[PDB]
Curated annotation (Swiss-Prot):
Residues shown, of full length: 595 to 893 of 1010
BP GO annotations: axon guidance; cell-cell adhesion
Keyword Disulfide bond in record: yes
UniProt subcellular location: Cell membrane
Start and end residues of each Fibronectin type-III domain: 3-90, 95-192, 197-288
Keywords: Cell adhesion, Cell membrane, Disulfide bond, Glycoprotein, GPI-anchor, Immunoglobulin domain, Lipoprotein, Membrane, Repeat, Signal
Region (Disordered): 74-103
GO cellular-component term (any): plasma membrane
Bias (Polar residues): 74-84
UniProt keyword Signal, yes or no: yes
Name by which UniProt lists this protein: Contactin-1
Family designation: Belongs to the immunoglobulin superfamily. Contactin family.
Provenance organism: Gallus gallus (Chicken)
GO MF entries: cell-cell adhesion mediator activity
Length: 288
């Protein structure tokens, strides 16, 4: 039949809205950002006679934006959408997924989780509360994160020993209340960066474009490799080139250097928490 006329919004709850409309020369569909497609909607009454100009759409998502249109019968053109409305909010009903963490620089405890999509926000002023305690303790430390779009918190505590075992978890929340906590993950705090320096560093000019850099290994168990910085005289130190080798290398050959050119050379130790102090700078000239 004909497309039903305009739509009037009668009531808005968190999971349902009441509707009334004008006659068309019924069935209801809804729409959100989830799809440009319209979804057939459930109602009260479950079935709508042509007799009635009103109905109530149900099982809507809290704090979601909705449009609605009406269809008459047989199976004529759908109506123009109603004005876009937003359902009332409720406490979030899903916990954050993919919870873990680890690493970071000295004295950090980095905690991570997958952020809930807008779809799950369920209310105004959405956020996350992060909870964590040293393994086997009584009390949790809570911190609030007002960033619905970030899945990371970094806790800083100078007292924290390196690789301290921790119990951690995350829940969502909005102005209406708290969502369910996530699974409890076991993460370790950041390890300390190496503090010692590569000793006995030497550089052997091999050619017009190559030098060999050698050094003595440090003894810290945590060290994972060594970084060799090299920059020329006419360069800023912070614009240096770099090479990284495993902790099982005592030397490395640097290629593609410019001929007859003064080069500064560096060696430092590193692990997952960053770089230790570099060796005293050694200068050389490449061959002509």
């Amino acid at each position: 039949p004909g497309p039903p006329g305009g739509i009037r919004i009668e009531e808005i709850r968190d999971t349902a809205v009441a509707l009334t409309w004008s006659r068309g020369t019924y069935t209801i569909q809804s729409k959100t950002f989830l799809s440009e497609e319209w979804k057939d909607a459930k109602t009260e009454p479950s079935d709508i006679e042509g007799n009635m100009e009103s109905a109530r759409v149900i099982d809507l998502i809290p704090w979601m934006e909705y449009e609605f249109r009406i269809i008459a019968t047989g199976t004529g053109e759908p109506s123009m959408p109603s004005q876009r409305i937003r359902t009332e909010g409720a406490p979030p009903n899903v916990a954050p997924s993919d919870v873990g963490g680890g690493g970071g620089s000295n004295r950090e405890l980095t905690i991570t989780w997958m952020p809930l999509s807008r779809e799950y926000h369920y209310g105004n002023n959405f956020g996350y509360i992060v909870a964590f305690k040293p393994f086997g303790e009584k009390e949790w430390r809570r911190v609030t994160v007002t960033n619905p779009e970030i899945g990371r918190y970094v806790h800083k505590d100078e007292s924290m020993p390196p690789s301290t075992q921790y119990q951690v978890k995350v829940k969502a929340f909005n102005s209406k209340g708290d969502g369910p906590f996530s699974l409890t993950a076991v993460i370790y705090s950041a390890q300390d960066a190496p503090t010692e320096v590569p000793t006995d560093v030497s550089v052997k000019v091999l050619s017009s474009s190559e030098i060999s850099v050698s050094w003595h290994h440090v003894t810290e168990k945590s060290v994972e490799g060594y970084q060799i910085r090299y920059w020329a005289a006419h360069d800023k130190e912070a614009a240096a080139q770099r090479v990284q080798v495993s902790n099982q290398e005592y030397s490395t050959k640097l290629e593609n250097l410019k001929p007859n050119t003064r080069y500064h050379i560096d060696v430092s130790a590193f692990n997952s928490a960053g770089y230790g102090p570099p060796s005293r700078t050694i200068d050389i000239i490449t061959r002509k």
